[PDB]
Amino acid sequence: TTLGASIGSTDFHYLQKDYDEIKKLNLNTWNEVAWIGDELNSKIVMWTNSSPVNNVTLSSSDFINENGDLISSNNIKISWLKETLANIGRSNPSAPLEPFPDIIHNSGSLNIEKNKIASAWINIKIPRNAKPGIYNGSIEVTADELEKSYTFDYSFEVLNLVQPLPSETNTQIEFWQHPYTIARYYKICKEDLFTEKHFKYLRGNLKEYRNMGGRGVIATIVHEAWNHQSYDSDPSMIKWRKNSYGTFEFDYSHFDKWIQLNIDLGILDPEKGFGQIKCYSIVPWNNRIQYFNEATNKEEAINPTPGSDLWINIWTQFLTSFMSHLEEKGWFNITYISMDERSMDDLKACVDLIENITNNSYEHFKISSAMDYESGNDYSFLDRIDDISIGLSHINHNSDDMKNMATHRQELGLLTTIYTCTGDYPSSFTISDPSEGAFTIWYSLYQNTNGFLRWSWDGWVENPLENVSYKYWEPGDPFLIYPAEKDSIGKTFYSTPRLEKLKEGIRDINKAKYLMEKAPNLKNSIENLIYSLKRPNKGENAYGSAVAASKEDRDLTISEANRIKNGINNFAREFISLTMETL
Ligand SMILES: CC(=O)N[C@@H]1[C@@H](O)[C@@H](O)[C@@H](CO)O[C@H]1O
Ligand SMILES: CC(=O)N[C@@H]1[C@@H](O)[C@@H](O)[C@@H](CO)O[C@H]1O
C-alpha cells in the first residue's frame, strides 16, 4: 500500500538498509508505566512503497483516565526523526557513509520519497500534579495519498508517586559545554562573544542540560588545552599575559560572563554550594601554556614539567590570583581545578601544589579528575581528589573493586562518576543503540557512583544536520545535541534519541534512589535488583568503531535497562499498595 505504519521501539534505530524487515511490522498498541511528573517516549515507524506520499502528519488525542482526569495533548510532542550521514568508522576515511535517524527534528508534515523509512518520535510529559490511574488515548497518522488513516492505541499508567526534581536528588551529571563552538556555528563574531547575541544561542541548550540534571560546568583556563582534538579550537576563558616585570596577569572576562550565565540560568548556585565549576586544566596537553608576552609584543609558549621550580612558580601565580578573583565574586567554594589522566608523578605534583594554597578560611581549591582506576583498595591518593570520573573501559565488571572504591568515596562525601568516550560499548554515538544510554546510567548506579560525566554536550563539526563525520572517533561522539539550522528563527538546538535515553536512565535511577530512601523495607531488595545488572561484551566493526560483541550482547544491553526499570516500577507499586492496605 501507499504508506505503512507501526509502533516501534525507541531503543534502536530503524535504518533504510532494514527496509524489507521493517515493512513486516504491525504493532498497533503501546503501554508503559510512569510516575507523576515523569516522561515517556515512543515512536511510530512508517514506510512508503513505489509512490511518494505527501503531507504525512501525526496527531495525539487528549489522554483520559478511569475517573475522567485529563492529561492534555498539550503535553504530547510528536517530532520527525531526521537522518544525517555518518562515516561508520573511527579514524577511517574510507569507511562507508550511511544515514542515521539521530536528530529529533520538527513537528508537522513530511513528504516522504518512494521506498523509504521514516519515523516520528513521541514525547509524553506527565504533569507534576497529574492524577494516578490508567490513561487512554490515541495517535492518528494521516496523509494525502492514504485513504484510511491509522489509529494507534496508547495507554499508560501513572503511579501515585512523584518524580523527584533534579535539585531533590543526589545525582551528579556533567556534560562538557563548548560555547565558542556555538559562536562559530551561529556566526557570532569575536566582538559579540558572551554578549546577549551569543547568549540567545546558549540559553535553550543550557536549560535543556539543567532540566535533566546537569550540575558540572566546564571552563578552560589555558589556551588550547586539548591540543585542538575537536573540530573547533578550544579558546581559553582566562587570557594569560606576561608583563615587563616578568610575572603573569590574567583577564577573566569571558570566564566571568560564562559562569554568570550559568548562575543566571539556575545551573550553579555558589551561595548554597550547588553545581560545580570545573577548570580545565592544571595539566593541559603537554603542559603547554600559551600567553602574550608584553616585553616582546608577541605570543609565546612554555611547557614546564609538573613539580619543577618553574612550574610551581607559574602555577602558584595562577592559583593565588584565581582564588582571589573567585573570592571577590563569591564563587570559590564551588570551583574545582581539573587534572586529567596523566603520569601519576604529574598528578602528585598537582595535588601537592593545590593543597599548599589556602584562603583565609583555611580551604584549598577542590580538585577534579578523570582517573585511570581499575583495582586495589589503596585510596590514599584518590581520597585527596574531590570528584573523579572513571571511564567504562577501565571498569572490570566481574569484580567489586570499583564499587568498593566508590562506596568509600560516598562515605567521605566525595563525588564519583563514570564516563564513556570513543572505543566504549555501551556508548552514546550516532551509530549506537539509543538504549545504551539508559544502560549507561543504570551502570553508574550499579557501581555505587553518583552518576555520569561525558565530554560531549555540543562539539559540533561543520554541518552535523547533514554529515556528522569527523577525523577522530565514532560518529556523533563529540555531541549529544545538534544545532538548529544556521538561519533558524526559534529553535537553537535539537535533541537526539541517545540523549533522551540518558535522560530516561537519569529519571529512573532517581526513582530507585527515592524508593530506597522512603521504603526502608524495600531498600535491600532494590539494591539486589540493581546488583543483578549484566554487562555486555564489546567488539569492533570492520571500520574500527566499538560495537556489541554479538547479537546476544546487543539484546542484553536493551533487555537489561528495561528489566531494571520494570522491576523498579514493581517495587514502586508494591510500596504504594502496601502503604494503602496498611493505612
Ligand atoms: C540541589 C543540589 O545541587 N544539591 C546537592 C546534593 O544533591 C549533593 O550532591 C551535595 C553534596 O554534598 O550538594 C548539595 O548541595
Ligand atoms: C573524560 C574524557 O572524556 N576524556 C577524553 C576526551 O577529552 C576526548 O578525547 C574523548 C573522545 O571520545 O575521549 C575521552 O577519553
Coordinates of C-alpha atoms and ligand atoms in Angstrom, one line a residue:
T1 CA 0.0 0.0 0.0
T2 CA 0.9 3.7 -0.2
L3 CA 2.1 4.3 3.5
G4 CA 2.6 1.5 6.0
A5 CA 2.9 2.3 9.7
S6 CA 3.7 0.6 13.1
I7 CA 4.6 1.4 16.6
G8 CA 8.4 0.9 17.0
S9 CA 11.0 0.9 19.8
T10 CA 12.9 4.0 20.9
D11 CA 15.7 1.6 21.9
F12 CA 17.3 1.2 18.4
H13 CA 17.3 2.9 15.1
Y14 CA 15.0 2.0 12.1
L15 CA 17.5 2.3 9.3
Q16 CA 17.0 2.4 5.5
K17 CA 19.0 -0.7 4.9
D18 CA 16.5 -2.7 7.0
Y19 CA 13.5 -1.6 4.9
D20 CA 12.3 -5.1 3.9
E21 CA 12.2 -6.3 7.5
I22 CA 10.7 -3.0 8.8
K23 CA 7.8 -3.4 6.4
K24 CA 6.7 -6.5 8.2
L25 CA 6.0 -4.7 11.4
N26 CA 2.5 -4.5 12.7
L27 CA 2.3 -3.2 16.3
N28 CA -0.9 -1.2 17.0
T29 CA -0.8 -0.8 20.8
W30 CA 1.6 0.6 23.3
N31 CA 1.7 0.7 27.1
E32 CA 4.1 2.0 29.7
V33 CA 4.2 2.9 33.4
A34 CA 5.1 6.4 34.6
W35 CA 5.3 8.4 37.8
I36 CA 3.6 11.8 38.4
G37 CA 5.9 14.3 36.7
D38 CA 7.7 11.7 34.7
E39 CA 8.2 11.5 30.8
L40 CA 7.7 8.7 28.4
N41 CA 8.8 8.3 24.8
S42 CA 7.6 6.2 21.9
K43 CA 8.0 6.0 18.2
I44 CA 5.9 5.4 15.1
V45 CA 7.8 3.9 12.2
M46 CA 6.4 4.4 8.6
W47 CA 7.3 3.3 5.1
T48 CA 6.4 4.0 1.5
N49 CA 6.3 1.6 -1.4
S50 CA 6.6 2.6 -5.0
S51 CA 4.9 6.0 -4.6
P52 CA 6.0 9.1 -2.7
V53 CA 3.4 10.1 0.0
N54 CA 2.9 13.7 0.9
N55 CA 1.7 15.7 3.9
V56 CA 2.2 12.8 6.5
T57 CA 1.0 14.1 9.8
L58 CA 0.6 12.6 13.3
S59 CA -1.7 13.9 16.0
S60 CA -2.4 12.8 19.5
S61 CA -5.7 12.9 21.4
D62 CA -6.1 14.0 24.9
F63 CA -5.4 11.2 27.4
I64 CA -8.1 10.4 30.0
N65 CA -8.2 8.1 33.0
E66 CA -10.9 5.9 34.5
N67 CA -12.2 9.0 36.5
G68 CA -12.2 11.3 33.6
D69 CA -9.0 13.0 34.7
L70 CA -7.3 14.6 31.7
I71 CA -3.7 14.9 30.5
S72 CA -4.0 17.4 27.6
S73 CA -2.4 16.8 24.2
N74 CA -0.5 19.9 25.1
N75 CA 1.8 17.6 27.0
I76 CA 2.4 15.4 23.9
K77 CA 5.0 16.5 21.3
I78 CA 5.4 14.5 18.1
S79 CA 8.6 15.2 16.1
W80 CA 10.0 13.8 12.9
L81 CA 13.4 12.0 13.2
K82 CA 15.7 13.5 10.7
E83 CA 18.6 11.5 9.2
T84 CA 22.2 12.7 8.7
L85 CA 25.2 10.9 7.1
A86 CA 27.8 9.2 9.3
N87 CA 31.1 7.6 8.4
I88 CA 30.6 4.4 10.3
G89 CA 34.3 4.0 11.3
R90 CA 36.8 5.5 13.7
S91 CA 39.7 7.5 12.1
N92 CA 38.9 5.8 8.8
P93 CA 38.4 8.0 5.8
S94 CA 37.3 5.1 3.5
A95 CA 34.6 3.7 5.8
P96 CA 31.1 4.0 4.3
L97 CA 28.7 6.8 4.9
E98 CA 25.3 5.7 5.9
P99 CA 22.2 7.6 7.1
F100 CA 21.1 7.5 10.7
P101 CA 17.8 8.9 12.4
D102 CA 19.9 10.7 15.1
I103 CA 18.0 14.0 15.2
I104 CA 14.7 14.7 17.0
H105 CA 13.6 17.3 14.5
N106 CA 10.4 19.2 14.0
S107 CA 6.6 18.7 14.3
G108 CA 4.3 19.0 11.4
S109 CA 4.0 17.4 8.0
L110 CA 6.6 15.4 6.0
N111 CA 6.7 14.4 2.3
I112 CA 8.3 11.0 2.0
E113 CA 10.0 9.7 -1.1
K114 CA 9.4 6.3 -2.6
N115 CA 10.8 3.1 -0.9
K116 CA 11.8 4.9 2.3
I117 CA 11.6 4.5 6.1
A118 CA 10.7 7.5 8.2
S119 CA 9.9 7.5 11.9
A120 CA 8.4 10.0 14.3
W121 CA 9.4 10.4 18.0
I122 CA 6.6 10.8 20.6
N123 CA 7.3 12.6 23.9
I124 CA 4.7 12.4 26.7
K125 CA 5.3 14.7 29.7
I126 CA 3.2 13.7 32.7
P127 CA 2.2 16.8 34.6
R128 CA 3.6 17.2 38.1
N129 CA 0.0 17.4 39.5
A130 CA -1.4 14.6 37.3
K131 CA -3.8 12.2 39.0
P132 CA -2.9 8.5 39.2
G133 CA -4.6 5.9 37.0
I134 CA -4.6 4.2 33.6
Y135 CA -4.8 6.8 30.9
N136 CA -6.0 6.1 27.4
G137 CA -5.7 8.0 24.1
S138 CA -4.8 7.6 20.5
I139 CA -2.3 8.7 17.9
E140 CA -3.5 9.2 14.4
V141 CA -1.5 9.1 11.2
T142 CA -3.0 10.7 8.1
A143 CA -1.5 11.6 4.7
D144 CA -2.8 12.8 1.3
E145 CA -2.3 9.5 -0.5
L146 CA -3.7 7.5 2.2
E147 CA -7.4 6.6 2.2
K148 CA -7.8 5.1 5.7
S149 CA -5.9 6.9 8.5
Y150 CA -4.0 4.8 11.1
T151 CA -5.1 5.0 14.8
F152 CA -2.6 3.7 17.3
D153 CA -4.0 2.9 20.8
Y154 CA -1.8 4.3 23.5
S155 CA -2.2 3.8 27.3
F156 CA 0.0 4.4 30.3
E157 CA -0.4 4.0 34.0
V158 CA 0.5 6.9 36.2
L159 CA 1.6 5.5 39.6
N160 CA 0.8 7.7 42.7
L161 CA 4.4 8.7 43.4
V162 CA 6.0 12.0 42.4
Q163 CA 9.1 12.0 40.1
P164 CA 11.8 13.9 42.1
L165 CA 13.0 17.3 40.9
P166 CA 16.7 17.3 39.9
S167 CA 17.5 19.5 42.9
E168 CA 15.8 17.0 45.2
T169 CA 18.2 14.2 44.1
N170 CA 21.8 13.5 44.7
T171 CA 22.6 12.5 41.0
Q172 CA 25.7 14.0 39.5
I173 CA 25.6 14.8 35.8
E174 CA 28.5 16.6 34.0
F175 CA 28.5 17.3 30.2
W176 CA 31.2 19.5 28.8
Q177 CA 29.8 22.6 27.0
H178 CA 31.8 24.4 24.2
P179 CA 30.3 27.9 23.9
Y180 CA 32.9 29.1 21.3
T181 CA 31.6 26.2 19.1
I182 CA 28.1 27.6 19.4
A183 CA 29.6 31.0 18.4
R184 CA 31.3 29.6 15.4
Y185 CA 28.3 27.7 14.1
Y186 CA 25.9 30.6 14.5
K187 CA 28.3 33.2 13.1
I188 CA 28.9 35.1 16.3
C189 CA 31.9 37.3 15.6
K190 CA 34.8 37.8 18.2
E191 CA 33.3 41.2 19.3
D192 CA 30.0 39.6 20.3
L193 CA 31.3 36.6 22.3
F194 CA 29.5 36.4 25.6
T195 CA 27.1 39.3 24.7
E196 CA 23.4 38.8 24.6
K197 CA 23.7 37.9 20.9
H198 CA 25.8 34.9 21.9
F199 CA 23.6 34.1 24.9
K200 CA 20.4 33.8 22.7
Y201 CA 22.1 30.7 21.1
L202 CA 23.2 29.2 24.5
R203 CA 20.2 29.6 26.8
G204 CA 17.9 26.9 25.3
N205 CA 20.5 24.2 25.3
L206 CA 21.7 25.0 28.8
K207 CA 18.1 24.9 30.2
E208 CA 17.9 21.5 28.5
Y209 CA 21.0 20.5 30.3
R210 CA 19.8 21.9 33.7
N211 CA 16.3 20.4 33.5
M212 CA 17.7 16.8 33.0
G213 CA 20.1 17.2 36.0
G214 CA 23.3 18.8 34.7
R215 CA 25.4 20.2 37.5
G216 CA 29.0 20.5 36.1
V217 CA 30.0 23.5 34.1
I218 CA 33.4 23.3 32.5
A219 CA 35.6 26.4 31.8
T220 CA 39.0 26.4 30.2
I221 CA 41.9 28.1 32.0
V222 CA 44.7 27.9 29.4
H223 CA 44.8 28.2 25.6
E224 CA 44.0 25.1 23.5
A225 CA 44.0 22.8 26.5
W226 CA 43.2 19.7 24.5
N227 CA 45.6 20.5 21.6
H228 CA 42.7 21.2 19.2
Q229 CA 41.4 17.5 19.3
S230 CA 38.0 18.9 18.3
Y231 CA 36.7 20.4 15.0
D232 CA 36.7 23.9 16.7
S233 CA 39.7 25.2 18.7
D234 CA 39.2 25.5 22.4
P235 CA 39.9 29.1 23.4
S236 CA 41.0 29.9 27.0
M237 CA 38.2 31.7 29.0
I238 CA 41.2 33.2 31.0
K239 CA 43.7 35.1 28.8
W240 CA 47.2 34.9 30.1
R241 CA 49.9 37.5 29.7
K242 CA 53.4 38.2 30.8
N243 CA 54.3 41.8 31.9
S244 CA 57.5 43.8 31.8
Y245 CA 58.3 42.6 35.3
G246 CA 58.3 39.0 34.1
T247 CA 55.2 37.9 36.1
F248 CA 51.8 36.9 34.8
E249 CA 48.5 38.7 34.6
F250 CA 45.0 37.2 33.9
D251 CA 42.0 38.5 32.0
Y252 CA 38.9 36.7 33.5
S253 CA 36.4 38.4 31.2
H254 CA 35.0 35.5 29.3
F255 CA 35.3 33.2 32.3
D256 CA 33.1 35.6 34.4
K257 CA 30.4 36.1 31.8
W258 CA 30.3 32.3 31.2
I259 CA 29.9 31.4 34.9
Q260 CA 27.4 34.3 35.5
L261 CA 25.3 33.0 32.6
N262 CA 25.1 29.6 34.2
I263 CA 24.3 31.2 37.6
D264 CA 21.5 33.2 36.0
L265 CA 20.1 30.1 34.3
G266 CA 20.0 28.3 37.8
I267 CA 22.7 25.7 37.0
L268 CA 25.2 27.0 39.5
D269 CA 24.3 28.4 43.0
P270 CA 27.6 29.4 44.7
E271 CA 25.9 30.6 48.0
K272 CA 24.3 27.3 48.7
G273 CA 27.1 25.2 47.1
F274 CA 25.1 23.7 44.2
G275 CA 26.8 22.7 41.0
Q276 CA 30.4 22.8 40.0
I277 CA 32.9 24.9 38.0
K278 CA 35.4 22.6 36.5
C279 CA 38.6 24.5 35.5
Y280 CA 40.4 22.6 32.7
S281 CA 43.3 22.3 33.4
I282 CA 46.4 22.4 35.5
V283 CA 47.7 19.6 33.3
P284 CA 46.6 20.8 29.9
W285 CA 48.1 19.0 26.8
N286 CA 51.9 18.6 27.1
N287 CA 51.8 21.1 30.0
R288 CA 51.8 23.8 27.3
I289 CA 50.9 27.4 28.4
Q290 CA 50.5 30.0 25.6
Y291 CA 50.5 33.6 26.7
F292 CA 51.0 37.1 25.3
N293 CA 54.5 38.4 26.2
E294 CA 54.4 42.2 26.7
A295 CA 58.2 42.7 26.6
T296 CA 58.4 41.2 23.1
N297 CA 54.9 42.1 21.9
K298 CA 54.2 38.5 20.6
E299 CA 52.6 35.2 21.7
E300 CA 55.0 32.9 23.5
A301 CA 54.6 29.4 25.0
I302 CA 56.3 27.3 27.7
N303 CA 56.0 23.6 28.7
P304 CA 57.2 23.4 32.3
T305 CA 57.4 20.0 33.9
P306 CA 55.0 19.4 36.8
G307 CA 56.8 19.8 40.1
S308 CA 59.7 21.8 38.7
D309 CA 60.6 25.1 40.4
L310 CA 59.4 27.0 37.3
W311 CA 56.1 25.1 37.1
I312 CA 55.5 25.6 40.8
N313 CA 56.2 29.3 40.3
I314 CA 53.9 30.0 37.4
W315 CA 51.0 27.8 38.8
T316 CA 51.3 29.5 42.2
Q317 CA 50.8 32.8 40.4
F318 CA 47.8 31.5 38.6
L319 CA 46.1 29.7 41.6
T320 CA 46.6 32.6 44.1
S321 CA 45.3 35.2 41.6
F322 CA 42.4 32.9 40.6
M323 CA 41.5 32.2 44.2
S324 CA 41.4 36.0 44.9
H325 CA 39.3 36.7 41.9
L326 CA 36.8 33.9 42.8
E327 CA 36.6 35.0 46.4
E328 CA 35.6 38.5 45.2
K329 CA 32.9 37.0 43.1
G330 CA 31.7 34.6 45.9
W331 CA 32.4 31.6 43.6
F332 CA 35.3 29.9 45.2
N333 CA 33.6 27.1 47.2
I334 CA 32.0 25.6 44.0
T335 CA 35.3 25.9 42.0
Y336 CA 37.4 22.8 41.2
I337 CA 40.8 22.6 39.5
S338 CA 40.6 19.8 36.9
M339 CA 43.6 17.5 36.2
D340 CA 43.4 14.6 33.7
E341 CA 44.7 11.0 33.2
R342 CA 48.4 11.9 33.3
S343 CA 51.5 10.4 34.8
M344 CA 50.9 9.8 38.4
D345 CA 54.1 11.9 39.2
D346 CA 52.4 14.8 37.5
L347 CA 49.2 14.4 39.4
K348 CA 51.1 14.1 42.7
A349 CA 52.8 17.5 41.9
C350 CA 49.3 19.0 41.1
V351 CA 47.7 17.8 44.4
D352 CA 50.8 18.9 46.5
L353 CA 50.7 22.4 45.0
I354 CA 46.9 22.7 45.3
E355 CA 46.9 21.7 49.0
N356 CA 49.6 24.3 49.7
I357 CA 47.4 27.2 48.6
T358 CA 44.8 28.2 51.0
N359 CA 42.4 31.0 51.5
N360 CA 41.9 32.8 54.8
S361 CA 39.3 30.3 55.9
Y362 CA 42.0 27.6 55.6
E363 CA 40.4 26.0 52.4
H364 CA 42.3 24.9 49.3
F365 CA 40.8 24.6 45.8
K366 CA 38.7 21.5 45.3
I367 CA 40.2 19.1 42.7
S368 CA 38.5 17.1 39.9
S369 CA 39.9 14.4 37.6
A370 CA 39.2 11.7 35.2
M371 CA 41.2 8.9 36.7
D372 CA 42.5 5.5 35.5
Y373 CA 41.4 3.3 38.5
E374 CA 40.9 -0.5 38.0
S375 CA 41.8 -2.3 41.2
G376 CA 43.2 -2.2 44.7
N377 CA 41.9 -0.6 47.8
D378 CA 44.7 1.9 48.3
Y379 CA 42.5 5.1 48.3
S380 CA 45.2 7.3 49.8
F381 CA 45.8 9.5 46.7
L382 CA 42.2 9.2 45.3
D383 CA 40.8 10.5 48.7
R384 CA 42.7 13.7 48.0
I385 CA 40.6 14.5 44.9
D386 CA 37.0 15.7 45.4
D387 CA 35.5 14.5 42.1
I388 CA 36.8 11.6 39.9
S389 CA 35.4 10.1 36.8
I390 CA 36.3 6.6 35.7
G391 CA 35.9 5.5 32.1
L392 CA 33.8 2.5 31.3
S393 CA 36.6 0.6 29.6
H394 CA 38.7 0.7 32.8
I395 CA 35.9 -0.9 34.9
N396 CA 36.4 -4.7 35.2
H397 CA 32.7 -6.0 35.5
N398 CA 33.4 -9.3 37.2
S399 CA 34.9 -7.5 40.3
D400 CA 33.8 -5.4 43.3
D401 CA 36.8 -3.1 43.2
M402 CA 35.1 -0.1 41.5
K403 CA 32.0 -0.4 43.8
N404 CA 34.3 -0.7 46.8
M405 CA 36.2 2.4 45.8
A406 CA 33.0 4.4 45.1
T407 CA 31.4 3.3 48.4
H408 CA 34.4 4.6 50.3
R409 CA 34.1 8.0 48.5
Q410 CA 30.4 8.1 49.2
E411 CA 31.2 7.6 52.9
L412 CA 33.6 10.5 52.8
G413 CA 31.1 12.8 50.9
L414 CA 33.3 12.9 47.8
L415 CA 32.0 12.7 44.2
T416 CA 32.4 9.8 41.8
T417 CA 31.1 9.3 38.2
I418 CA 31.7 7.0 35.3
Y419 CA 32.1 8.3 31.8
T420 CA 32.0 6.9 28.2
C421 CA 34.0 8.0 25.2
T422 CA 35.5 6.8 21.9
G423 CA 36.0 3.0 21.9
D424 CA 33.4 2.3 24.6
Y425 CA 30.4 -0.1 24.4
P426 CA 27.8 0.7 25.6
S427 CA 28.1 4.3 24.4
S428 CA 26.3 7.4 23.1
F429 CA 27.3 7.6 19.4
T430 CA 25.2 8.3 16.4
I431 CA 25.7 4.6 15.5
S432 CA 24.8 3.4 19.0
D433 CA 21.5 1.9 20.0
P434 CA 20.0 4.8 21.9
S435 CA 19.1 2.4 24.8
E436 CA 22.9 2.1 25.5
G437 CA 22.3 5.5 27.3
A438 CA 19.8 4.2 29.8
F439 CA 22.1 1.1 30.4
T440 CA 25.0 3.6 31.0
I441 CA 23.1 5.5 33.6
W442 CA 22.0 2.2 35.4
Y443 CA 25.6 1.1 35.3
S444 CA 26.7 4.3 37.2
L445 CA 24.3 3.2 40.0
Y446 CA 25.4 -0.5 39.8
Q447 CA 28.9 0.8 40.6
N448 CA 27.6 2.9 43.6
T449 CA 28.7 6.1 41.9
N450 CA 26.9 9.5 41.9
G451 CA 26.2 9.5 38.2
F452 CA 27.6 10.2 34.8
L453 CA 30.1 12.5 33.0
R454 CA 30.6 13.0 29.3
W455 CA 32.9 15.3 27.5
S456 CA 30.4 15.8 24.6
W457 CA 27.4 18.2 25.0
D458 CA 27.9 20.2 21.8
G459 CA 31.2 19.6 20.0
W460 CA 29.7 20.1 16.5
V461 CA 31.5 19.5 13.3
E462 CA 30.9 21.8 10.2
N463 CA 27.3 20.9 9.3
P464 CA 26.2 18.0 11.6
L465 CA 22.5 18.3 10.5
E466 CA 23.8 16.8 7.1
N467 CA 27.1 14.9 8.0
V468 CA 28.5 14.3 11.4
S469 CA 31.7 12.6 10.2
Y470 CA 34.9 13.8 11.9
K471 CA 38.5 12.7 11.5
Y472 CA 38.5 11.2 15.0
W473 CA 36.2 8.9 16.9
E474 CA 32.9 7.1 16.3
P475 CA 30.4 9.4 14.6
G476 CA 28.4 11.7 16.9
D477 CA 30.9 11.1 19.8
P478 CA 31.6 14.9 20.4
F479 CA 27.9 16.0 20.7
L480 CA 24.7 14.8 22.3
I481 CA 22.6 17.7 20.9
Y482 CA 22.5 19.0 17.3
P483 CA 22.5 22.7 16.5
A484 CA 19.5 24.0 14.7
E485 CA 19.7 25.2 11.0
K486 CA 22.0 28.2 10.7
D487 CA 19.2 30.5 9.6
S488 CA 16.8 29.2 12.3
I489 CA 14.4 31.7 13.9
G490 CA 13.0 29.9 17.0
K491 CA 15.0 26.7 17.6
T492 CA 18.6 26.8 18.7
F493 CA 19.3 23.0 19.1
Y494 CA 17.7 19.6 18.6
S495 CA 17.7 16.6 20.9
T496 CA 18.7 13.0 20.0
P497 CA 17.3 9.7 20.9
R498 CA 20.6 8.9 22.5
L499 CA 20.3 11.9 24.8
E500 CA 16.6 11.2 25.5
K501 CA 17.8 7.7 26.7
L502 CA 20.3 9.2 29.1
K503 CA 17.5 11.4 30.4
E504 CA 15.4 8.3 30.8
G505 CA 18.1 6.5 32.8
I506 CA 18.6 9.5 35.0
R507 CA 14.9 9.7 35.8
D508 CA 14.7 6.0 36.6
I509 CA 17.8 5.8 38.9
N510 CA 16.3 8.8 40.7
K511 CA 13.2 6.6 41.3
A512 CA 15.3 3.8 42.6
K513 CA 17.1 6.2 45.0
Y514 CA 13.9 7.8 46.1
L515 CA 12.4 4.4 47.0
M516 CA 15.5 3.2 48.7
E517 CA 15.2 6.2 51.0
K518 CA 11.5 6.3 51.5
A519 CA 10.9 2.5 51.7
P520 CA 13.5 1.0 54.2
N521 CA 11.7 -2.4 53.9
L522 CA 12.5 -2.5 50.2
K523 CA 15.9 -0.9 50.1
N524 CA 17.9 -4.1 50.2
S525 CA 15.6 -5.8 47.7
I526 CA 16.1 -2.8 45.4
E527 CA 19.9 -3.0 45.8
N528 CA 19.9 -6.6 44.9
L529 CA 17.8 -5.9 41.7
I530 CA 20.4 -3.3 40.7
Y531 CA 23.3 -5.7 41.6
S532 CA 21.9 -8.2 39.2
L533 CA 22.6 -5.9 36.2
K534 CA 24.6 -7.8 33.5
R535 CA 27.2 -6.1 31.3
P536 CA 27.6 -7.0 27.6
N537 CA 30.8 -7.7 25.8
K538 CA 32.1 -5.4 23.1
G539 CA 34.0 -5.7 19.9
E540 CA 34.6 -3.6 16.7
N541 CA 33.1 -3.3 13.3
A542 CA 35.2 -3.6 10.2
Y543 CA 36.0 0.2 10.2
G544 CA 37.3 0.5 13.8
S545 CA 34.1 1.5 15.7
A546 CA 33.2 -0.1 19.0
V547 CA 30.0 -2.2 18.8
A548 CA 28.4 -5.1 20.7
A549 CA 30.4 -8.4 20.7
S550 CA 27.3 -10.3 19.3
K551 CA 23.6 -10.1 18.8
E552 CA 23.1 -11.6 22.2
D553 CA 25.2 -8.9 23.8
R554 CA 23.4 -6.2 21.8
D555 CA 20.0 -7.6 23.0
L556 CA 21.3 -7.8 26.6
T557 CA 22.0 -4.1 26.7
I558 CA 18.3 -3.3 25.8
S559 CA 16.7 -6.1 27.8
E560 CA 18.7 -5.2 31.0
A561 CA 17.8 -1.4 31.0
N562 CA 14.1 -2.3 30.6
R563 CA 14.2 -5.1 33.2
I564 CA 15.7 -2.9 36.0
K565 CA 13.1 -0.2 35.1
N566 CA 10.2 -2.6 35.2
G567 CA 11.5 -4.1 38.5
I568 CA 11.7 -0.6 40.0
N569 CA 8.1 0.2 38.9
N570 CA 7.0 -3.0 40.6
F571 CA 8.7 -2.1 43.8
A572 CA 7.0 1.4 43.5
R573 CA 3.7 -0.4 43.1
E574 CA 4.1 -2.9 46.0
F575 CA 5.1 0.1 48.1
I576 CA 2.1 2.2 47.2
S577 CA -0.3 -0.9 47.6
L578 CA 1.1 -1.9 51.0
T579 CA 1.1 1.6 52.3
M580 CA -2.7 1.8 51.4
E581 CA -3.8 -1.7 52.7
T582 CA -1.9 -0.9 55.9
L583 CA -3.1 2.9 56.3
Ligands
LIG1 C1 20.5 21.0 44.9 C2 21.9 20.4 44.8 O1 22.6 20.7 43.8 N1 22.1 19.6 45.9 C3 23.4 18.9 46.3 C4 23.2 17.5 46.7 O2 22.5 16.6 45.8 C5 24.6 16.8 47.0 O3 25.2 16.5 45.7 C6 25.5 17.7 47.9 C7 27.0 17.2 48.0 O4 27.4 17.3 49.4 O5 25.5 19.0 47.5 C8 24.1 19.5 47.5 O6 24.1 20.9 47.7
LIG2 C1 37.0 12.4 30.3 C2 37.1 12.3 28.7 O1 36.2 12.2 28.0 N1 38.3 12.3 28.2 C3 38.6 12.1 26.7 C4 38.1 13.4 25.9 O2 38.9 14.5 26.2 C5 38.1 13.0 24.4 O3 39.4 12.8 23.9 C6 37.2 11.8 24.3 C7 37.0 11.4 22.8 O4 36.0 10.4 22.7 O5 37.9 10.7 24.8 C8 37.9 10.8 26.2 O6 38.7 9.8 26.7

